[PDB]
Amino acid sequence: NSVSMIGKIAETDVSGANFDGNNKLSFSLFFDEKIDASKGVPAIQILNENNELVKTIPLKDYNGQKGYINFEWDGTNEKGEKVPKGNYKIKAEYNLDSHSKQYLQTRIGRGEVESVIFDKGKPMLRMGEMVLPIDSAIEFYQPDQK
Amino acid sequence: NSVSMIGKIAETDVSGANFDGNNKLSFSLFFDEKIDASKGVPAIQILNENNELVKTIPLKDYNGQKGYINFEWDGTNEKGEKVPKGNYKIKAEYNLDSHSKQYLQTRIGRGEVESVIFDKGKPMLRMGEMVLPIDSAIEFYQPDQK
Amino acid sequence: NSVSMIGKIAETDVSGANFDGNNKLSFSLFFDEKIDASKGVPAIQILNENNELVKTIPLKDYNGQKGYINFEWDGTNEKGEKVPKGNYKIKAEYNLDSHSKQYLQTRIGRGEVESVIFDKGKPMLRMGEMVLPIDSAIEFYQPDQK
Amino acid sequence: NSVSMIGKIAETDVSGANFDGNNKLSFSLFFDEKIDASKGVPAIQILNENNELVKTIPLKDYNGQKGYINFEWDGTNEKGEKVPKGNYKIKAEYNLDSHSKQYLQTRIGRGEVESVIFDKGKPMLRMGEMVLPIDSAIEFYQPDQK
C-alpha cells in the first residue's frame, strides 16, 4: 500500500545470484558514491556458499561511475576454470578512506529504490535491474547518509 | 491509508477512454517535459480496441507546454467519419531524441499524482482531470527520472 | 501506521465549531498565502447550520500573516446580540485576484498537517490548535499548489 | 509497512534507561540544534522513578555539537554514592532563550528516525544507538520545526 520506500536505500535479504554452470551471469551493484580508483584498489569479490573466494573482478576501470552498474561474470574462478553451479555471493569494496583505513562496501541486493511495482496486486521494489518483493527488505534509510 | 503517492508519477491500468458514438471526448495527457515541436513531429495517436490507428492529432501547436494538457476528440477518423462507439486507447509521442532516434511517450492513465481523495473512505488518486482508484495503479516513481 | 500526511495540506469533514451560548469561541484558520489587505476586502464569515450569515470579522488587521492564525468570536451577531447555541460554520476570503476577480478561500478544518499523534494507538492529525482523527480527512495535497 | 517515518522526529514512550546497580550506563540524547554553552547553563538531569533528581551532568563541554550525542553515567549521585538499581529518567536542557527565558529540551527516547529496520518482519525505528518498536512511538513531526 505504501510507496514511501521510493527514493530510499533498501537493504534486502537477497545477497547471492545463481550460476547455472555454463551461462554468463549478469548482475548489478549499487555504488553510493562515485568510484575513485586512486583510493585503494577497488574490486568485486565473488564468494561461494561457504564464503570462499572464487573470483575477483577489478573495479579500476569504472573510475568515476556511481549508482547502479551492470557487470558480467563468465562463471570462472581465478584460474579460468568454470566453477560448480549454485548460489554465489557478490560483494564489492571501493574508495579506501585515509583515516579509517577502510573501504566503502556494497553488495547485490541493496540500493536505491527506483520505483514500486504492483504485481497483481503484490508490491515489488525496482532496484536497478532487480525486482524484489517487499518482504525481502530488511532495512531502509535515506541516500547520502547512514 | 497512505498518501505517499502524492507527488509521484503513477502508471495505472486505465489506458483507454470511452466514445459513445456522437458526443465529443474530453481527455487529458501528462507531459513529463515541455513539448518541443522542433524535435521530430509530436502527435497524439488514437487507437481502437484492436490497436488499429483511428485518428492522429498533431501536437505542434502545444509547443512549450508541460504537465497535464486537456484535449478534445470529435470522434471522427482521419476522413472525418464518426467511428464506432467503444473504448479508444490514446497515446502520444513528443520530443524526438537525436541520439536514440526515439520519441518520449505518454498516454492516458499516467502522470503526477496531484492529490489523494478519500471516497467514503476509499482512496482515490487525482491525476489531472481523472480520478482513479488506488488499485488501478500498477507502478510509482519520482518525476524527472525513471 | 503512515505518517506520510505530515507536511501535506489536509481537507477534513470538520467545517464547524460549537458555540455553547455564552462562552467565547477560540478557533483557528489556515492561510496558504500571506494575507494582503490591499487585495479586495479580506474577512471571516460565520454561518449558522442553515448557511445563514451570522457574523463577519474583517481580516484587514492581519495583513502580512500566513499559516495558522488564532481568532476569537464572542458569539454575537452583527448587532451584538448573542446567537443561539449550536454549530457554526467558519470560512474566510482573502487576497482578491485581479484576473479571476475571485478571492482565495479557507475554512476551519483544513491546513498543513504539523504532526501525527498516536492516541493509544489511534492516529490523530495535528493541524494548528486542532487535533483530528485520520478518518475525518477527505483529501490531501502538497502546500503551495492544488 | 510504511517507511515514511524515516527523516521525521519521533517522540516515543521510552523515557528511562535501566541502571543495574554496578555497571556504567551508556545512553544517547538528540539535540535538535547545536548546543551553545553561552546560552544559559546546559545540562543533563537524571531522575529516579519518583522524579527526584539524582545526578546532573554539565553540557558545557559539548558546545558546538548537535544531533545524537553519546554519554555515560557511572551510576553515582551528586556525592559519588552508587544509587539503587532501577529505571532512571534522563532529560536535558540547553540553549536558554533570551526572550522566553526558557531552555530547549530533550530526553532519551526522541529524535530523528535514521532508518527503519524490519525484524522478522516487525518494524523497528533506528534512533541513534537505540532501536525501538513502532508502537512505542507516540508522535512524529518534521525536524527544524514543531
Side-chain angles (χ1 to χ4, degrees):
Chain A
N1 169 273
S2 192
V3 310
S4 59
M5 299 159 173
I6 293 168
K8 304 296 191 303
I9 307 283
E11 304 280 340
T12 79
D13 59 24
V14 173
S15 62
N18 178 260
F19 177 56
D20 62 33
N22 184 57
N23 300 341
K24 98 172 45 170
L25 178 67
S26 288
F27 70 91
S28 150
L29 289 178
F30 180 87
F31 295 84
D32 309 73
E33 286 183 12
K34 284 190 176 189
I35 299 166
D36 182 347
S38 71
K39 289 171 71 59
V41 182
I44 299 166
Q45 302 76 45
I46 310 179
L47 288 48
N48 70 17
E49 267 309 307
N50 293 277
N51 295 323
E52 303 175 329
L53 183 63
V54 148
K55 184 68 148 197
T56 297
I57 307 179
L59 281 180
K60 190 167 154 182
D61 291 322
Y62 293 85
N63 181 73
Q65 304 180 35
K66 72 180 289 171
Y68 287 107
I69 304 173
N70 306 299
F71 302 92
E72 288 178 341
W73 174 41
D74 58 21
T76 65
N77 60 18
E78 217 49 74
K79 291 119 171 190
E81 334 186 331
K82 288 214 174 182
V83 302
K85 71 186 267 185
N87 234 38
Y88 287 82
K89 304 172 185 187
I90 302 179
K91 316 189 301 196
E93 287 197 311
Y94 69 110
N95 293 7
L96 167 70
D97 180 82
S98 168
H99 177 68
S100 72
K101 298 186 164 283
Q102 292 185 329
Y103 289 86
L104 299 183
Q105 309 202 299
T106 191
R107 60 158 175 107
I108 282 192
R110 66 169 295 275
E112 187 174 36
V113 180
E114 300 177 298
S115 82
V116 164
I117 299 172
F118 288 91
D119 198 66
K120 317 78 177 166
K122 299 289 201 16
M124 314 287 284
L125 305 172
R126 179 198 298 284
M127 306 171 52
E129 289 295 327
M130 303 183 56
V131 176
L132 299 171
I134 289 294
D135 44 271
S136 83
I138 61 193
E139 194 181 14
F140 299 86
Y141 50 89
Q142 265 156 5
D144 169 349
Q145 332 97 316
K146 251 275 305 172
Chain B
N1 169 273
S2 192
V3 310
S4 59
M5 299 159 173
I6 293 168
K8 304 296 191 303
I9 307 283
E11 304 280 340
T12 79
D13 59 24
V14 173
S15 62
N18 178 260
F19 177 56
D20 62 33
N22 184 57
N23 300 341
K24 98 172 45 170
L25 178 67
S26 288
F27 70 91
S28 150
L29 289 178
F30 180 87
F31 295 84
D32 309 73
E33 286 183 12
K34 284 190 176 189
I35 299 166
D36 182 347
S38 71
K39 289 171 71 59
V41 182
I44 299 166
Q45 302 76 45
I46 310 179
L47 288 48
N48 70 17
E49 267 309 307
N50 293 277
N51 295 323
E52 303 175 329
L53 183 63
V54 148
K55 184 68 148 197
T56 297
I57 307 179
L59 281 180
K60 190 167 154 182
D61 291 322
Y62 293 85
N63 181 73
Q65 304 180 35
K66 72 180 289 171
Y68 287 107
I69 304 173
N70 306 299
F71 302 92
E72 288 178 341
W73 174 41
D74 58 21
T76 65
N77 60 18
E78 217 49 74
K79 291 119 171 190
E81 334 186 331
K82 288 214 174 182
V83 302
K85 71 186 267 185
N87 234 38
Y88 287 82
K89 304 172 185 187
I90 302 179
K91 316 189 301 196
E93 287 197 311
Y94 69 110
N95 293 7
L96 167 70
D97 180 82
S98 168
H99 177 68
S100 72
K101 298 186 164 283
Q102 292 185 329
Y103 289 86
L104 299 183
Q105 309 202 299
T106 191
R107 60 158 175 107
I108 282 192
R110 66 169 295 275
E112 187 174 36
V113 180
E114 300 177 298
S115 82
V116 164
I117 299 172
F118 288 91
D119 198 66
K120 317 78 177 166
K122 299 289 201 16
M124 314 287 284
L125 305 172
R126 179 198 298 284
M127 306 171 52
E129 289 295 327
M130 303 183 56
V131 176
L132 299 171
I134 289 294
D135 44 271
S136 83
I138 61 193
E139 194 181 14
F140 299 86
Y141 50 89
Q142 265 156 5
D144 169 349
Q145 332 97 316
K146 251 275 305 172
Chain C
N1 169 273
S2 192
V3 310
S4 59
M5 299 159 173
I6 293 168
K8 304 296 191 303
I9 307 283
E11 304 280 340
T12 79
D13 59 24
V14 173
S15 62
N18 178 260
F19 177 56
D20 62 33
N22 184 57
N23 300 341
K24 98 172 45 170
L25 178 67
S26 288
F27 70 91
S28 150
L29 289 178
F30 180 87
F31 295 84
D32 309 73
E33 286 183 12
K34 284 190 176 189
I35 299 166
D36 182 347
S38 71
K39 289 171 71 59
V41 182
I44 299 166
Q45 302 76 45
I46 310 179
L47 288 48
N48 70 17
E49 267 309 307
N50 293 277
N51 295 323
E52 303 175 329
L53 183 63
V54 148
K55 184 68 148 197
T56 297
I57 307 179
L59 281 180
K60 190 167 154 182
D61 291 322
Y62 293 85
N63 181 73
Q65 304 180 35
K66 72 180 289 171
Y68 287 107
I69 304 173
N70 306 299
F71 302 92
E72 288 178 341
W73 174 41
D74 58 21
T76 65
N77 60 18
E78 217 49 74
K79 291 119 171 190
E81 334 186 331
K82 288 214 174 182
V83 302
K85 71 186 267 185
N87 234 38
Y88 287 82
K89 304 172 185 187
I90 302 179
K91 316 189 301 196
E93 287 197 311
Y94 69 110
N95 293 7
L96 167 70
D97 180 82
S98 168
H99 177 68
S100 72
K101 298 186 164 283
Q102 292 185 329
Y103 289 86
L104 299 183
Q105 309 202 299
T106 191
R107 60 158 175 107
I108 282 192
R110 66 169 295 275
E112 187 174 36
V113 180
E114 300 177 298
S115 82
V116 164
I117 299 172
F118 288 91
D119 198 66
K120 317 78 177 166
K122 299 289 201 16
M124 314 287 284
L125 305 172
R126 179 198 298 284
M127 306 171 52
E129 289 295 327
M130 303 183 56
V131 176
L132 299 171
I134 289 294
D135 44 271
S136 83
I138 61 193
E139 194 181 14
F140 299 86
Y141 50 89
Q142 265 156 5
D144 169 349
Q145 332 97 316
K146 251 275 305 172
Chain D
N1 169 273
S2 192
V3 310
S4 59
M5 299 159 173
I6 293 168
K8 304 296 191 303
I9 307 283
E11 304 280 340
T12 79
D13 59 24
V14 173
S15 62
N18 178 260
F19 177 56
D20 62 33
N22 184 57
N23 300 341
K24 98 172 45 170
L25 178 67
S26 288
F27 70 91
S28 150
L29 289 178
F30 180 87
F31 295 84
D32 309 73
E33 286 183 12
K34 284 190 176 189
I35 299 166
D36 182 347
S38 71
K39 289 171 71 59
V41 182
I44 299 166
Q45 302 76 45
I46 310 179
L47 288 48
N48 70 17
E49 267 309 307
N50 293 277
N51 295 323
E52 303 175 329
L53 183 63
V54 148
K55 184 68 148 197
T56 297
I57 307 179
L59 281 180
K60 190 167 154 182
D61 291 322
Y62 293 85
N63 181 73
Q65 304 180 35
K66 72 180 289 171
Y68 287 107
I69 304 173
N70 306 299
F71 302 92
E72 288 178 341
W73 174 41
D74 58 21
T76 65
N77 60 18
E78 217 49 74
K79 291 119 171 190
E81 334 186 331
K82 288 214 174 182
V83 302
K85 71 186 267 185
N87 234 38
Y88 287 82
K89 304 172 185 187
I90 302 179
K91 316 189 301 196
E93 287 197 311
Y94 69 110
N95 293 7
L96 167 70
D97 180 82
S98 168
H99 177 68
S100 72
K101 298 186 164 283
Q102 292 185 329
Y103 289 86
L104 299 183
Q105 309 202 299
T106 191
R107 60 158 175 107
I108 282 192
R110 66 169 295 275
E112 187 174 36
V113 180
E114 300 177 298
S115 82
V116 164
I117 299 172
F118 288 91
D119 198 66
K120 317 78 177 166
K122 299 289 201 16
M124 314 287 284
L125 305 172
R126 179 198 298 284
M127 306 171 52
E129 289 295 327
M130 303 183 56
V131 176
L132 299 171
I134 289 294
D135 44 271
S136 83
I138 61 193
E139 194 181 14
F140 299 86
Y141 50 89
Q142 265 156 5
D144 169 349
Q145 332 97 316
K146 251 275 305 172

